[PDB]
Design a protein around this ligand. Sequence first.
Ligand SMILES: *[C][C]N1=NN([C]2O[C]([C]OP([O])(=O)OP([O])(=O)O[C][C]3O[C](N4[C]=NC5=C4N=[C]N=C5[N])[C]([O])[C]3[O])[C]([O])[C]2[O])C([C][C][C][C][C][C][C][C][C][C][C][C])=[C]1
Ligand SMILES: [Zn+2]
Lengths: 289, 8
Amino acid sequence: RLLDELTLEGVARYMQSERCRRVICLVGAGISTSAGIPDFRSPSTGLYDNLEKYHLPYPEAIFEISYFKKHPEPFFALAKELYPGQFKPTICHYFMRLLKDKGLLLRCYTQNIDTLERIAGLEQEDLVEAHGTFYTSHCVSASCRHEYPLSWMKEKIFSEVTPKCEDCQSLVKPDIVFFGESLPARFFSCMQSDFLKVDLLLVMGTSLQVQPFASLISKAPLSTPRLLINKEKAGQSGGMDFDSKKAYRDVAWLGECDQGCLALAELLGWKKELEDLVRREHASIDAQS
Amino acid sequence: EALPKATG
Ligand SMILES: *[C][C]N1=NN([C]2O[C]([C]OP([O])(=O)OP([O])(=O)O[C][C]3O[C](N4[C]=NC5=C4N=[C]N=C5[N])[C]([O])[C]3[O])[C]([O])[C]2[O])C([C][C][C][C][C][C][C][C][C][C][C][C])=[C]1
Ligand SMILES: [Zn+2]
């Protein structure tokens, strides 16, 4: 086994060894809830528990592409209701930024569309935005593909006018990979090389229920340690094995992503670095307001 | 016919 003990401190010591050079992060909505952007599965607060008003056949229909193309108004109403007053990345995003700054980050595969990874300073090469982004939008006509910015989209969303393409009058959709849409080719290009050379998987803020993203946890070599930082266990059935007698590489830190990243950063000797990074960047954002 | 799709 590569971990000396199945704890956060053991993962930290492994990350300080020379064997751990390439770290892949797999993140979901949980790493952004502390930024005011709700998740999907959490009781009461999750999006799937707050869609009775939109009168949908099933909660996921508001995020399914065929439903959107038939009835886009519920999605854009929900978007107006959820559009954040401020885009501030979390301590978890800035922990990934520290991984980048120290040359340890091979890739961040994110399921989120909030661009907080970019805002925290992760560059395009560092990112697999597996499910797209809200930042750009496109006409849904494949022979048109007129691109519209977040300003145009946000204006149409708050004026409660359904976004329509100025050239062919088709629907304009944010560049989110809705359910039923294919993931970008970059996902499948990166995975091929990334998961042959990964030394540590860091899974944060995801329930690991949406495919093909969840399957990524089984693409790593069997020796590669995997650390989950999440309010609840996830990815158990090559699934996650935290508790069995055969457990050897999977560690679950149950709690807030921000708290677990603070603790791991402190165990690595990065407490003050992460604090300064968060302070400076949140100040820069509050200044550019 | 297409690359793998986002599915719950
Ligand atoms: C196919 C494609 N697609 N996808 N999608 C979605 O789905 C999914 C989901 O998953 P996730 O991300 O993982 O999430 P959930 O399930 O909810 O889970 C979460 C998790 O985490 C946790 N937590 C929470 N919080 C917390 C935690 N932990 C720690 N810490 C903290 N703080 C819980 O417990 C659980 O486990 C994915 O993939 C996604 O992507 C889709 C859909 C999309 C949609 C979008 C849009 C929305 C609206 C708008 C918004 C705007 C903003 C700016 C598709
Ligand atoms: Zn068009």
